[PDB]
Write a protein that binds this ligand. Structure first.
Ligand SMILES: [Cl-]
Ligand SMILES: [Cl-]
Ligand code: NA
Length: 129
């Protein structure tokens, strides 16, 4: 599913991402924009053989099981395919664990390089939330 911008903002808010670990909703929408272009089916293979999945490009090296990342962890205790669903629940619950790790939203490279320090509130401007 390719979410609309406000459609994704509302779903992320309903699932409790807004201000989760102090990161306003605009930060999460911006991250999803540059990680996946709001496409839940986005995937990208990393050089080490792990794969990033879904709207927030969550990595199988640590966070989900895809059966093809030897020696990896599954810290969100989910199949990586659950991160590709039209329903973002699994991606949100797993992102809450990731952002709780030492480096906050810097875990998302596209957030650090394209969202951090910018006017992130613009990503939710015009939305009815
Ligand atoms: Cl915001
Ligand atoms: Cl594996
Ligand atoms: Na894994």
């Amino acid at each position: 599913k390719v979410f609309g911008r406000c459609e994704l903002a509302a779903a992320m808010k309903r699932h409790g991402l807004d201000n989760y670990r102090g990161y306003s909703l605009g930060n999460w929408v911006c991250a999803a924009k540059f990680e996946s272009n709001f496409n839940t089916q986005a995937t990208n293979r990393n050089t080490d053989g792990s794969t990033d999945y879904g709207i927030l490009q969550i990595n199988s090296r640590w966070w989900c099981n895809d059966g093809r990342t030897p020696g990896s962890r599954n810290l969100c205790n989910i199949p990586c395919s659950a991160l590709l669903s039209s329903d973002i629940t699994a991606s949100v619950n797993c992102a809450k664990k990731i952002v709780s790790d030492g480096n906050g939203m810097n875990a998302w490279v596209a957030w650090r390089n394209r969202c951090k320090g910018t006017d992130v509130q613009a990503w939710i401007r015009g939305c009815r939330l």
